[PDB]
Amino acid sequence: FDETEIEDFKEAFTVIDQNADGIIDKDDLRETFAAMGRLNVKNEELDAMIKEASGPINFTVFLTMFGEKLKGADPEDVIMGAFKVLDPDGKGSIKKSFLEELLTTGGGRFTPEEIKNMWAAFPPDVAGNVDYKNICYVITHGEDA
Amino acid sequence: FDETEIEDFKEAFTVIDQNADGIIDKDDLRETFAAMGRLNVKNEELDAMIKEASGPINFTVFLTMFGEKLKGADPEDVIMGAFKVLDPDGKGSIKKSFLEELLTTGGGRFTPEEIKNMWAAFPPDVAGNVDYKNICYVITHGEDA
Amino acid sequence: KLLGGGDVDHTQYAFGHTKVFFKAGLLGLLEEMRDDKLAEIITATQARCRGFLMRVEYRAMVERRESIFCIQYNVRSFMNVKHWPWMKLFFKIKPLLK
Amino acid sequence: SKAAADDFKEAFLLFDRTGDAKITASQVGDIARALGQNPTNAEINKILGNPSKEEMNAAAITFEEFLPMLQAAANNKDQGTFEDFVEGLRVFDKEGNGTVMGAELRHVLATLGEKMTEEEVEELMKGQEDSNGCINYEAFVKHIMSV
Amino acid sequence: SKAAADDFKEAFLLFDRTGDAKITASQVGDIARALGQNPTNAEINKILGNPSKEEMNAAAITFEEFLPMLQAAANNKDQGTFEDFVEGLRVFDKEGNGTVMGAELRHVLATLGEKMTEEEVEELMKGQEDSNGCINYEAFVKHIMSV
């Protein structure tokens, strides 16, 4: 965890903790979702978020919960560092079959089935290994941009 | 030491001395590191910083310790002064082989092996002697920007 | 340029303006001996190369060691997270920030 | 002999991916090179077949066969003379300066004799050949013999 | 003599790159020039060989040989007469004004007698020759004798 990433989680903690007392309760979760447009947010969704913690969601409990789910989270500059080492001549997005062979043949984390799941929402270019960069974006901030 | 550089070290001394009494003790070092995100900062790192001084870290002991480690520290405007004299026509980053030849053939501080270490984290452009300016940045403030 | 390769007697032939000249069956014999002599010379020079070739692969494999992991773990996160309320939230919200 | 070098056995535990203390016959060529031996691939191939050992079918190994094969390859290290390596490349390009044109060395290392992949050829020229397209083989063969 | 000039020993510590207080025989020509002596390179060469000293093989030095070689070169400073330097270049170009055409002095300084590199020839004309292509050697030889 770099310090600017921890400051981003402190700003997200303050936007969900609308009572500003330092502990995100279930009313803060529901009023942050209602301010984003969720008028139908069920109480069972709020209870499942609180069921991931053993205590009240203060800043260090929110940081430890996000730490334990993001144990391989990598910032965009280090993902582009590794992709610039995979394309060491610069500019070009690397081939689809080169990333499939190098993921498998180096590591068990790069096994195929997982490579079909990589191509599956990370579209073609991304999946193929040709573009580059959009995948670093969606690994640090999810969903389609 | 120019006076604005000494005022920058006075501001860094005040941010690490969180008790504001004028002497940075080991608790100030640990609480400044914990406020930057270092939850695992060992006591042996704090003891190695205090082992570089012969007494308590007040403002003049911190200035003399930084003076004795930065006996060739050069501000960015004087490094760009010297690089504008090496590129006297302006704008262009100077060639890789020109900086290797002129470092060696003028001085013993510009010997090759050291030139391979210059290229080694100061990347290509920087190492090569083509770009310019990013090296002045990282000599006044380290690490990748 | 072609004759560059082969464990052949580089003697036995000779070039000129319209064509190459070649021995048989003596010069033919010569070359042959020669041929064997390069396998030696060659075969040995190949090896080191081969050797050496892979020796650089290890230096790369090794470097790579971590950059992968980084990549490895890093992805996994996301696959888990991207479905998490809190994380989607942070997501829509991450922009309003400065 | 021990000089009993027990670090050859510790390096066999770094190349065996299953942890059972056996190394397949296809890895023995590259691990002899990683222990400080450069047998040519035809030599590694011959010896194998010589001993009615087929590298075409599944293989396992034991340390008790890999140790004497490394000791049979260790006598052939007297073939590694650097005079002949630099004189080979000195006969490969004209003029009195040691420079191969880029693509001459890349196509010769991939297609002449024991085929080296073009991926390995690019990894062996990376850094020693600059953008002039001229590989200085005095420093190139020096750095190739540094590993 | 000391006048014991101990600054010659302090300048030997600025030219020895290893710090062991020895200066190789190939540096002795340029360091005699940096101490205020202009022996020609053939003279530096002869003296060396004269003393069965080979500048072809590795060399070291000691201050105890470099001091008397600088004192043997110091008698030859009576050959540095500026009348003959300005009259040499005055016979090298027509008319009553001291100007050499640019390329005449550059090609003569690189190819006639003791070969000066064209890099050093450009560094000695830089500033004294303007864009008219005419080197005024009255001020040019004045500035060359200012160092």
Curated annotation (Swiss-Prot), chains A, B:
Q: Which GO terms describe its molecular function?
A: calcium ion binding
Q: How is it modified after translation?
A: The N-terminus is blocked. N,N,N-trimethylalanine, found in other myosin light chains would not have been detected in the N-terminal tryptic peptide in PubMed:7358336 because it would remain trimethylated and ninhydrin negative after hydrolysis.
Q: Is Calcium one of the keywords UniProt gives this record?
A: yes
Per UniProt, where does Ca(2+) bind? D17, N19, D21, D28
Output the Gene Ontology cellular-component terms: cytoplasm; myosin complex
Name the UniProt key words of this record, in alphabetical order: Calcium, Metal-binding, Methylation, Motor protein, Muscle protein, Myosin, Phosphoprotein, Repeat
Q: One biological process GO term for this chain? A: muscle contraction
Where the record annotates domain EF-hand, the positions are 9-39, 74-109, 110-144
Per UniProt, subunit arrangement is:
Myosin is a hexamer of 2 heavy chains and 4 light chains.
What else does the entry mention about this protein?
Answer: This chain binds calcium.
Q: What does this protein do?
A: Myosin regulatory subunit that plays an essential to maintain muscle integrity during early development. Plays a role in muscle contraction.
Q: What is this protein called?
A: Myosin regulatory light chain 11
Q: Which organism is it from?
A: Gallus gallus
* Gene for this chain: MYL11
Q: Which residues of the full protein are shown?
A: 29 to 164 of 168
From Swiss-Prot, chain C:
Quote the subcellular location field of this record.
Cytoplasm, Myofibril
Q: Which residues form the IQ domain?
A: 38-67
Q: Where is this region: Hinge?
A: 93-95
Highest taxon of the lineage:
Eukaryota
Chain positions with Pros-methylhistidine modification: H10
Region of interest (Actin-binding), residue spans = 14-28
Domain commentary: The rodlike tail sequence is highly repetitive, showing cycles of a 28-residue repeat pattern composed of 4 heptapeptides, characteristic for alpha-helical coiled coils. Limited proteolysis of myosin heavy chain produces 1 light meromyosin (LMM) and 1 heavy meromyosin (HMM). HMM can be further cleaved into 2 globular subfragments (S1) and 1 rod-shaped subfragment (S2).
Stated family: Belongs to the TRAFAC class myosin-kinesin ATPase superfamily. Myosin family.
Q: Which proteins does it associate with, and in what oligomeric form? A: Muscle myosin is a hexameric protein that consists of 2 heavy chain subunits (MHC), 2 alkali light chain subunits (MLC) and 2 regulatory light chain subunits (MLC-2).
Question: What is its biological role?
Answer: Muscle contraction. Myosin is a protein that binds to F-actin and has ATPase activity that is activated by F-actin.
Q: What is this protein called?
A: Myosin heavy chain, skeletal muscle, adult
Swiss-Prot record, chains D, E:
The record ties this protein, via SUPFAM superfamilies, to: EF-hand
- Keyword annotations of the record: Motor protein, Muscle protein, Myosin, Repeat
Post-translational modification remark = The N-terminus is blocked.
Task: Give the multimer and partner information.
Answer: Myosin is a hexamer of 2 heavy chains and 4 light chains.
GO MF annotation terms: calcium ion binding
What is the protein's name according to its record? Answer: Myosin light chain 3, skeletal muscle isoform
What is this organism's lineage?
Eukaryota, Metazoa, Chordata, Craniata, Vertebrata
Top-rank taxon, per record: Eukaryota
**Which stretches make up the EF-hand domain?**
7-38, 41-76, 80-115, 115-147
Tagged with keyword Repeat? yes
Q: Origin organism of this chain?
A: Gallus gallus (Chicken)
Gene Ontology CC annotation, any one:
myosin II complex
Q: Which InterPro entries match?
A: CALM/Myosin/TropC-like, EF-hand-dom_pair, EF_hand_dom
